Amino acid sequence: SFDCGKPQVEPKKCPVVGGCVAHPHSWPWQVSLRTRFGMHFCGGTLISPEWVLTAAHCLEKSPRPSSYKVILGAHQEVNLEPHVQEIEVSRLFLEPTRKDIALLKLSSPAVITDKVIPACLPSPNYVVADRTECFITGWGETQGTFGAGLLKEAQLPVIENKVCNRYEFLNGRVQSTELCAGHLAGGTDSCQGDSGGPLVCFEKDKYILQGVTSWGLGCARPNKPGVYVRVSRFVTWIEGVMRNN
């Protein structure tokens, strides 16, 4: 009884390196991906009770679903609250054109609560406009900024691909199935441990998943925005996997 994309605790939305610590449970689709006996190493986004979207490179350690588990409803990176859901992964579906996106099927459906709610997917092939303010979240490296060990958020503007691909920026590296976000001055960015997590943009009354954290030329460097897989180019594929599996 919770609509996708609508947090039950309002996000702080403060103007992960930089940014701020999120209000607990204000990003209820945020997933922590772990190995069977391991700690957090990547993020993900709950997109339905049985399905988590992440980056394909987060599965490089093992091709077997039994190697992975997801933590839902968390705020701490290490000290799990006495209400979080821990669910083993049952299947791995990597994007077939070899782009950096993958679906995890959960061994049992997540219980949807005020703290665990799926994100909404965009319309197929939607292109986020230049300068749109979006939010990235995760438990990654902070490079000396406050908030290590807690779920962090940062608000970053999207940079259109034609700009991001200029020589002084990312010099032709960014593909049409990727998008860029960040401040050219640097200082605020997703970082190691944030891969696979969400980039969301607010539209009307809910948050829409537009990016999956993927790579960068470092983190938070001036003139080097972060790169995210463009979710809208994969919605049709995602829908097909869920429908057929």
């Binding site: 590296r173 970082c191 891969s195 790579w215």
Partner: peptide, 14 residues
């Protein structure tokens, strides 16, 4: 110079 944002990062010569 590309590095993924996983722990640990996967890095490339560029």
């Amino acid at each position: 110079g590309r590095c993924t944002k996983s722990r640990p990062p996967i890095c490339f010569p560029d």
